[PDB]
C-alpha cells in the first residue's frame, strides 16, 4: 500500500524532502529528516491511532515512560534542524523528540514517549512548531504589551521598567532594590516568562550589586543615566562576580568617549550590545562596529528591520518627536542626521544575512514594536533572499540554511546571551515546554497556539458561545494556562544566583517557577548559533560608508514586504 506525497502531506504534514512556503514570503523550508515509522503515525480522533490498546498504552502509570502531552507530527524549525517529529512533554518540560505511541504494537516508539491514560494530545500535523521567542530588549511600560508579544510567538521578556515613568520609557531599567521587588511581585500576574534588568550605573560597586542581590537578572547601561567609562566598568565588574549579562546603549553624543573609549572600558569582558546599528542608540556614527568584536553579543531592535522606503522618514520624525527636537535648531537637526543613517540601516540587513548580527529584539514601546520581532526577522530573510539570492550554503533549492540562521536570532541566541539557554530558547530535550504552533499561511505573523510550561497560554480561537471553537470572531485570547494559580506553574521568573541563594522568592512570596541565570560571562560571539562571524567593520566618519574586511556594503530599500497588508486589518 503506497500513499502519494500530496495525500501524505495533507494527512500527516510534510515528510523528508517536502518543502513548505513561510507565509507569503519567497522562503521555502525542506523537511531534513523524519522520526516516524510510515504506517504508525500517531493521530487523535474518532477511529484514529491514539486509542486504548492501540496507539494509546492502557497499562502504564504516568511515572512509567508516559507523557503528559504529545504534539503529533510537528514540523520543527529550530537552530538544531528543520525536521518532522512528535514532541513529548512531561512536568512542563520537553522530555522527548521522536516517535510517540504504544510500544505494545508500534515500531520505532521513543521509549519515554508512551501515550497513556495520562496523555493529552495536540495535533501538530500541517503546523510549523518553533521555540517561543526570547525578547531581551523589553521596556515594561504598559501591561497590554504582553498579549501583543504572545500573539507574535514571544514567550520570554527580558528588560526593565516600572510602567510609564520617564526612566522606563527611555531605558530597560528597574532601578534599585525596592523597584525590583515591586516589579517581581507585579510579574506574578504576567502570563509570560520575565527577567528584570537593574540600572548599570554607579561609581561604587555596592549600589549596583544590591540590585542583583534584590532579584535582578542582569543590568542595563544606558546613555540617559550616563554611559560613562565608570558606569561601564563597575557594571561589568558586578556582572563578572554575579554571573549575569550586561546590555549597553552607548554614549551617542561621544561626550566622555568615542567607541574605542567604550571598548577600552569594556576591556574584553562579555557584553550584549543593544540596537547595534545605532538608530536606537549609540556612539554616532560608528557604534555598529561593535558587531565585529569577539566579546560582543550584538542584537538589532526591530523598527530598522528590514530597510524599507518609509524607514528613514518614520525614524527621523520618531527621533524628533521623542527628543522634543526642533527642525529650526541646527544642533538638533545635526544630531538627528548623525543618528538616523540610511548607510548603516542598509548595511544592517546584510550584516544579519552574513551572521554578523546574532540577535533580534523589540525595544518594545521605547523605539520598537512588542509584537514584530518574529515578523521582521522573516521579512529581513525574505528581502535578503530576493536581493542576494539563496545563500551559497543552500541545497535542493531550499532556504534551510538561511531559515536556521534567522530563527536562531530570536530563539537560542538571546537565551545564550542572557544565561537562560539551559531553560528556554530551543526545542531540545530537557528544556521548558515553551512552544509556538503556526499555520504555514500565518507563519511569523499570527501564532495559532502558544504553549507555556506545557499548557496552552494564548490561542487564535473563535466565538466562546459557539457549538465549536472555529466560528467568528477568531482572535487572540488568553487560555487556561493564564488563569488562577496556573499562571505560576506555566511561567518562569529568571533571577540572579545571589538573590536565589538569599531567599528573595520566599521573602516576596513569589509562586512562579524560579529560573537561575548562569554561564553568561565565559561566552562570546563564537557561541552565537549560525551567527558567529567576527570581522573588522569600518564605518567612514565622513560618508558613513560601511566596509567589512575593506568591502563596501550598500543595499537598497524595498517598497513592499510580505507578512504585511495581506494579513493586518490596520
Amino acid at each position: 500500500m503506497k500513499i502519494n506525497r500530496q495525500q501524505y502531506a495533507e494527512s500527516y504534514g510534510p515528510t523528508v524532502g517536502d518543502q513548505v512556503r513561510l507565509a507569503d514570503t519567497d522562503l521555502w523550508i525542506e523537511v531534513e529528516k523524519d522520526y516516524t515509522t510510515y504506517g504508525d503515525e500517531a493521530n487523535f480522533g474518532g477511529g484514529k491511532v491514539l486509542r486504548e490498546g492501540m496507539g494509546e498504552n492502557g497499562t502504564y502509570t504516568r511515572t512509567e515512560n508516559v507523557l503528559d502531552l504529545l504534539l503529533t507530527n510537528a514540523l520543527i524549525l529550530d537552530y538544531t534542524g528543520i525536521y518532522k517529529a512528535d514532541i513529548g512533554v512531561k512536568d512542563g518540560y520537553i522530555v522527548g523528540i521522536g516517535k510517540g505511541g504504544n510500544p505494545d504494537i508500534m515500531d520505532g516508539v521513543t521509549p519515554n514517549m508512551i501515550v497513556g491514560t495520562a496523555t493529552e494530545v495536540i495535533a501538530a500535523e500541517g503546523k510549523i512548531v518553533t521555540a517561543g521567542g526570547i525578547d531581551t530588549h523589553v521596556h515594561f511600560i504598559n501591561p497590554d504589551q504582553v498579549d501583543v508579544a504572545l500573539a507574535n510567538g514571544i514567550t520570554t521578556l527580558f528588560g526593565g521598567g516600572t510602567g510609564p515613568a520617564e526612566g522606563s520609557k527611555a531605558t530597560t531599567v528597574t532601578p534599585g532594590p525596592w523597584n525590583i521587588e515591586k516589579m517581581l511581585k507585579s510579574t506574578e500576574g504576567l502570563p509570560i516568562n520575565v527577567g528584570i534588568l537593574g540600572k548599570g550605573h554607579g561609581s561604587s560597586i555596592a549600589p549596583i550589586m544590591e540590585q542583583i542581590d534584590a532579584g535582578a537578572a542582569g543590568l542595563k547601561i544606558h546613555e540617559d543615566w550616563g554611559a560613562t567609562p565608570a558606569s561601564i566598568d563597575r557594571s561589568l565588574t558586578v556582572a563578572d562576580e554575579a554571573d549575569v549579562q550586561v546590555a549597553i546603549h552607548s554614549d551617542t553624543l561621544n561626550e566622555a568617549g568615542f567607541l574605542e573609549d567604550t571598548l577600552r572600558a569594556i576591556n574584553g569582558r562579555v557584553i550584549h550590545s543593544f540596537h547595534v546599528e545605532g538608530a536606537g542608540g549609540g556612539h554616532a556614527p560608528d557604534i555598529m562596529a561593535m558587531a565585529g568584536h569577539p566579546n560582543v553579543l550584538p542584537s538589532s531592535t526591530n523598527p530598522t528591520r528590514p530597510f524599507t522606503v518609509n524607514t528613514i522618514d518614520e525614524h527621523l520624525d520618531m527621533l524628533m518627536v521623542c527628543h522634543h527636537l526642533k527642525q529650526n535648531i541646527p544642533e538638533d537637526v545635526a544630531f538627528a542626521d548623525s543618528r538616523i543613517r540610511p548607510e548603516t540601516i542598509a548595511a544592517e540587513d546584510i550584516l544579519h544575512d552574513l551572521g554578523i548580527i546574532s540577535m533580534m529584539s523589540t525595544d518594545a514601546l521605547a523605539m520598537g514594536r512588542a509584537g514584530e520581532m518574529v515578523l521582521r526577522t522573516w521579512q529581513t530573510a525574505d528581502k535578503m533572499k530576493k536581493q542576494r539570492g539563496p545563500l551559497a550554503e543552500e541545497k535542493n533549492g531550499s532556504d534551510n540554511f538561511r531559515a536556521k540562521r534567522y530563527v536562531s536570532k530570536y530563539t537560542i541566541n538571546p537565551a545564550i546571551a542572557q544565561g537562560i539557554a539551559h531553560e528556554v530558547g530551543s526545542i531540545e530535550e530537557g528544556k521548558f515546554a515553551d512552544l509556538v504552533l503556526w499555520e504555514p499561511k500565518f507563519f511569523g505573523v499570527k501564532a495559532d497556539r502558544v504553549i507555556k510550561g506545557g499548557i496552552i497560554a494564548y490561542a487564535q480561537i473563535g466565538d466562546p458561545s459557539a457549538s465549536i471553537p472555529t466560528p467568528q470572531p477568531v482572535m487572540g485570547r488568553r487560555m487556561y494556562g493564564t488563569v488562577g494559580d496556573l499562571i505560576h506553574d506555566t511561567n518562569i521568573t529568571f533571577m540572579s544566583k545571589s538573590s536565589i541563594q538569599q531567599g528573595v522568592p520566599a521573602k516576596l512570596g513569589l509562586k512562579r517557577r524560579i529560573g537561575t541565570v548562569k554561564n553568561c560571562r565565559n561566552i562570546g560571539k563564537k557561541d552565537m548559533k549560525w551567527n558567529d562571524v567576527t570581522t573588522d567593520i569600518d564605518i567612514n566618519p565622513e560618508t558613513y560608508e560601511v566596509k567589512v574586511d575593506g568591502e563596501v556594503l550598500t543595499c537598497e530599500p524595498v517598497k513592499e514586504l510580505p507578512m504585511a497588508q495581506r494579513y493586518f486589518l490596520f
Binding site: 499561511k441 466565538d463 458561545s465 470572531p473
Partner: protein, 100 residues
C-alpha cells in the same frame, strides 16, 4: 439592552465588515481579515433576515470573488463559520471555499 458576551463580540464583526466595505468601495482589493469580516457579517445579517442555513451556505459563496481580493486570499480561506440567531434559534453556518 442586556448584551451577553457573544452579542458584544459579534458587534466587532459588523464593524470590521463596515470598515472592509468602505475599503472595497474606494477600489481596494481586500485582504484576508477584510474578506472574512465581510462574509461573516453577511451570514449573521442573513440569519437576522430569516434566511435558512441552506440559503446562506449557497449565498456565502457569491459575496466576494477572486477579483475582489488580493493574490492568495481565496486559497487562504478554506471556510468561514458563523453562529447567529435564526427564527428557530442559534445555528451554525459553514461556507466552504467562499471565494473561488
Amino acid at each position: 439592552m442586556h448584551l451577553n458576551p457573544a452579542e458584544k463580540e459579534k458587534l466587532q464583526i459588523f464593524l470590521a465588515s463596515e470598515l472592509a466595505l468602505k475599503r472595497k468601495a474606494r477600489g481596494l482589493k481586500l485582504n484576508y481579515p477584510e474578506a472574512v469580516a465581510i462574509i461573516t457579517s453577511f451570514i449573521m445579517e442573513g440569519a437576522r433576515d430569516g434566511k435558512t442555513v441552506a440559503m446562506l451556505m449557497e449565498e456565502g459563496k457569491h459575496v466576494l470573488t477572486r477579483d475582489d481580493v488580493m493574490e492568495g486570499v481565496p486559497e487562504m480561506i478554506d471556510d468561514i463559520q458563523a453562529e447567529a440567531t435564526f427564527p428557530d434559534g442559534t445555528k451554525l453556518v459553514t461556507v466552504h471555499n467562499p471565494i473561488s
